Amino acid sequence: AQHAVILDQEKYDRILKEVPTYRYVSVSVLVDRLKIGGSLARIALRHLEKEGIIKPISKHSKQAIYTRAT
Amino acid sequence: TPVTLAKVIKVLGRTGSRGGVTQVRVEFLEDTSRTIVRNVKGPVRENDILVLMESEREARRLR
Amino acid sequence: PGVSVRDVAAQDFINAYASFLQRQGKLEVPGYVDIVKTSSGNEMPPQDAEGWFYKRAASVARHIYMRKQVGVGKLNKLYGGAKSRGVRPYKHIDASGSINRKVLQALEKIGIVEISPKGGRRISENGQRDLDRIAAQTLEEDE
């Protein structure tokens, strides 16, 4: 109810331009960037991995971890 | 800030009515040849190193 | 080389065989599936909704492949976890016999299992067959 829950176009764009300079990226990180609830944050993770920016260094459920691509 | 390292050279025993406190005679490493008796808070044996936050002041008993 | 299913990790295998039974179409799913719960020790239905009956079939197969014979009673016990009795302490509780007896019946029609003497269900010869083949498939996905 305090907003983070859908996709408001500007949002998607924010997610593509802002995730560089993220040495650490995970569910808790994506939430903390004043946006995305844990759900669509988790969907974002899979989809920012579709290509680039984030590198899968950690495995699993409960904990993701990613790094800027190089 | 100065640090001041002193190596425990002897264990004297327990004080503090509770008995958690341990008297000990230490020896500095940075310039030895001088010894002081301190009161420790944790468990202690011979040859351990206390970081005396200040260097010249010893205690005795504890109530 | 040459292969077994024991040569393959449980989740890799079972999720592989699951997709298979799915990707296939030959099955016999009860039809009460989607409205049913799998154990009274549970709270919600499966979240896989469409499917999950494949997950248990694939699981049930693999379990029977790994041993002599097993009945519904054993699988009801295998599959059932702790039930919250609300404010009263947890008790283990058996799972649903319908799900399993129909999983066993379906797998047999598809000829992956057979009504072993002594009792229960033994892996079928044609089960040994196909299971070892998809196990072989999944190791190959990591060639």
């Binding site: - | - | 077994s4 024991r6 040569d7 990790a9 449980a10």
Partner: protein
């Protein structure tokens, strides 16, 4: 028959039996590769003797292990035990004393009780509490 020794390992009430015969270097537990063996976060506990004493060494032998009893951690500490004991048993009867004794030196100098079973065992509970030492709560009034 070929050269073959059988050994065991225990931790709590787990008991892991090994059969180390002469072969082409397999390492299987119950009936699966030693590379599976999940609880997973512990997998390197059972790889451990292999890497401790050089991943070769096993080329002349076959190893099978069957654990019953204990639980999902007990059984790991037991199976790694019987594995390393089985390696030192085999050299003991077949290879040579130096080779064997080198092998004990490696294990012990590292060791998580690889050759030597942990005597720790559950203490009996006694009436007046839910545990062995723990006591029921009292009040005075």
């Amino acid at each position: 028959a070929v050269p073959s020794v059988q050994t065991f390992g225990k931790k709590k009430s787990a008991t892991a039996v090994a059969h180390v015969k002469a072969g082409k270097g397999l390492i299987k537990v119950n009936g699966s590769p030693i590379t599976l063996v999940e609880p997973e976060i512990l997998r390197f506990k059972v790889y451990e003797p292999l890497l401790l004493v050089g991943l070769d060494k096993f080329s002349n032998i076959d190893i099978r292990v069957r654990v019953t009893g204990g639980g999902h951690v007990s059984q790991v500490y037991a199976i790694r035990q019987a594995i390393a004991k089985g390696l030192v048993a085999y050299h003991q009867k077949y290879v040579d004393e130096q080779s064997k004794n080198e092998l004990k030196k490696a294990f012990t100098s590292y060791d998580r009780t690889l050759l030597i079973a942990d005597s720790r065992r559950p203490e009996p509970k006694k009436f007046g509490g839910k545990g062995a030492r723990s006591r029921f709560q009292k009040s005075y009034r």
